[PDB]
Design a protein around this motif. Sequence first.
Motif, mmCIF file in Angstrom:
data_model
loop_
_atom_site.group_PDB
_atom_site.id
_atom_site.type_symbol
_atom_site.label_atom_id
_atom_site.label_comp_id
_atom_site.label_asym_id
_atom_site.label_seq_id
_atom_site.Cartn_x
_atom_site.Cartn_y
_atom_site.Cartn_z
ATOM 1 N N UNK A 144 34.443 45.413 34.028
ATOM 2 C CA UNK A 144 33.566 44.274 34.263
ATOM 3 C C UNK A 144 32.100 44.685 34.330
ATOM 4 N N UNK A 145 31.254 43.990 33.578
ATOM 5 C CA UNK A 145 29.824 44.280 33.591
ATOM 6 C C UNK A 145 29.103 42.992 33.974
ATOM 7 N N UNK A 146 27.780 43.039 34.047
ATOM 8 C CA UNK A 146 27.024 41.851 34.421
ATOM 9 C C UNK A 146 26.382 41.174 33.221
ATOM 10 N N UNK A 147 26.521 39.855 33.166
ATOM 11 C CA UNK A 147 25.941 39.076 32.091
ATOM 12 C C UNK A 147 24.902 38.130 32.664
ATOM 13 N N UNK A 148 24.377 37.247 31.826
ATOM 14 C CA UNK A 148 23.358 36.304 32.267
ATOM 15 C C UNK A 148 23.927 35.062 32.949
ATOM 16 N N UNK A 149 25.183 34.740 32.654
ATOM 17 C CA UNK A 149 25.816 33.537 33.192
ATOM 18 C C UNK A 149 26.997 33.719 34.142
ATOM 19 N N UNK A 150 27.245 32.695 34.953
ATOM 20 C CA UNK A 150 28.361 32.713 35.887
ATOM 21 C C UNK A 150 29.671 32.594 35.112
ATOM 22 N N UNK A 151 30.631 33.453 35.445
ATOM 23 C CA UNK A 151 31.940 33.448 34.797
ATOM 24 C C UNK A 151 32.851 32.564 35.650
ATOM 25 N N UNK A 152 33.226 31.404 35.117
ATOM 26 C CA UNK A 152 34.064 30.463 35.856
ATOM 27 C C UNK A 152 35.430 31.023 36.248
ATOM 28 N N UNK A 153 36.087 31.711 35.317
ATOM 29 C CA UNK A 153 37.402 32.281 35.593
ATOM 30 C C UNK A 153 37.356 33.194 36.817
ATOM 31 N N UNK A 154 36.404 34.127 36.845
ATOM 32 C CA UNK A 154 36.293 35.018 37.997
ATOM 33 C C UNK A 154 35.893 34.253 39.249
ATOM 34 N N UNK A 155 35.115 33.187 39.080
ATOM 35 C CA UNK A 155 34.695 32.393 40.229
ATOM 36 C C UNK A 155 35.903 31.794 40.955
ATOM 37 N N UNK A 156 36.992 31.547 40.228
ATOM 38 C CA UNK A 156 38.200 30.992 40.842
ATOM 39 C C UNK A 156 38.709 31.917 41.938
ATOM 40 N N UNK A 157 38.421 33.207 41.790
ATOM 41 C CA UNK A 157 38.828 34.201 42.774
ATOM 42 C C UNK A 157 37.702 34.461 43.773
ATOM 43 N N UNK A 158 36.506 34.716 43.254
ATOM 44 C CA UNK A 158 35.353 35.022 44.090
ATOM 45 C C UNK A 158 34.954 33.929 45.075
ATOM 46 N N UNK A 159 35.222 32.673 44.735
ATOM 47 C CA UNK A 159 34.862 31.577 45.626
ATOM 48 C C UNK A 159 35.710 31.571 46.896
ATOM 49 N N UNK A 160 36.720 32.437 46.948
ATOM 50 C CA UNK A 160 37.609 32.507 48.108
ATOM 51 C C UNK A 160 37.450 33.764 48.963
ATOM 52 N N UNK A 161 36.561 34.670 48.571
ATOM 53 C CA UNK A 161 36.383 35.900 49.338
ATOM 54 C C UNK A 161 35.979 35.646 50.785
ATOM 55 N N UNK A 162 35.125 34.648 51.001
ATOM 56 C CA UNK A 162 34.661 34.321 52.348
ATOM 57 C C UNK A 162 35.791 33.889 53.284
ATOM 58 N N UNK A 163 36.964 33.603 52.726
ATOM 59 C CA UNK A 163 38.102 33.177 53.535
ATOM 60 C C UNK A 163 38.982 34.349 53.966
ATOM 61 N N UNK A 164 38.721 35.531 53.414
ATOM 62 C CA UNK A 164 39.507 36.721 53.744
ATOM 63 C C UNK A 164 38.636 37.953 53.981
ATOM 64 N N UNK A 165 37.514 37.764 54.668
ATOM 65 C CA UNK A 165 36.596 38.861 54.932
ATOM 66 C C UNK A 165 37.218 40.011 55.720
ATOM 67 N N UNK A 166 38.082 39.682 56.672
ATOM 68 C CA UNK A 166 38.717 40.699 57.504
ATOM 69 C C UNK A 166 40.023 41.222 56.929
#
Length: 267
Positions: A144-166
Amino acid sequence: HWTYEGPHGQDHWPASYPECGNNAQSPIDIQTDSVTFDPDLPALQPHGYDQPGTEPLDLHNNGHTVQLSLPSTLYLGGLPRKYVAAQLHLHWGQKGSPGGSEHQINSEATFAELHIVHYDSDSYDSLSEAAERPQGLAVLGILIEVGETKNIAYEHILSHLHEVRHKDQKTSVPPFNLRELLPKQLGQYFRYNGSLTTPPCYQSVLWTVFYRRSQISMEQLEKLQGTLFSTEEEPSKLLVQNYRALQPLNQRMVFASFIQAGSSYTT
Ligand SMILES: *[C@@H]1O[C@H](CO)[C@@H](O[C@@H]2O[C@H](CO)[C@@H](O[C@@H]3O[C@H](CO[C@H]4O[C@H](CO)[C@@H](O)[C@H](O)[C@@H]4O)[C@@H](O)[C@H](O[C@H]4O[C@H](CO)[C@@H](O)[C@H](O)[C@@H]4O)[C@@H]3O)[C@H](O)[C@H]2NC(C)=O)[C@H](O)[C@H]1NC(C)=O
Ligand SMILES: Nc1ccc(C(=O)c2ccc(-c3ccc(S(N)(=O)=O)cc3)cc2)cc1
Ligand SMILES: [Zn+2]
């Protein structure tokens, strides 16, 4: 018990897990001027990826990574055996530091790496059982590298990280098209015999590392790098640099499912 850094860090894994010190380990640096083109390598043919069941998927912070449970209904059709999906997880570095991926291509690492783990259901009945056997597992590695735009597919996972911080916390993720987590040109990949990149480091993995990289935004990267903790409670410590150092190729051959003009190898 084991960790990436410290007394029980990766440099000391062999002291507790013998196989971590063996000679057919992962990850490795895939140097194209040394790979061998194999015209018989089939298309991977991921089945069921577009719809991973209808029930919510479990997302778990196990202290070493964030892991998404996958239904066995998903599987790969282009391998020697029928490999069914079990889970996927990620490896990353840390904000302000380079690298983060486990594998490298031509000595270049990227910021993160996605691993989609499958096991031979023809021969075994569980991921754990298959994990200790030759080619018992088939893992897909996506750099995985960084691009100019938000990747929706990965966002499906990343949008939930705040729910499992511990560490050990879990949450649910609605099914989504997993195929969109994969890079372009699925027909271009590298194949080699390797191991789990974490203890016990069993040499049971038939690795597939895609040639092309997936891209997430710089904002998504910063979120992946500093949301999760490796601790279960305060004091809290960010889960960072959870990638294993490169392991010697040790004369193994790395095969390429493709070839092109200007390739560092020939037919
Ligand atoms: C990861 O590591 C494993 C284990 O080392 C490798 O698997 C071996 O792969 C080799 C090469 O393909 C296999 O040997 C070849 O077997 C051919 C017959 O294949 C059938 O029969 C075997 C044995 O029952 C089965 O395993 C297989 O599934 C098939 O049903 C032979 O035709 C080959 O002989 C020819 O080539 C050799 C050179 O290699 C010449 O010397 C011969 O004269 C002849 O021309 C050859 O013997 C071997 O059987 C596999 N072992 C196992 C345990 O599966 C993986 O290839 C490797 N993967 C990667 C990506 O590196
Ligand atoms: N004490 C144990 C608990 C679980 C197990 C497993 O069944 C197990 C299976 C797979 C994995 C694993 C590790 C790393 C990777 S990787 N990072 O190479 O994709 C994949 C699976 C880890 C543990 C073994 C011992
Ligand atoms: Zn992994």
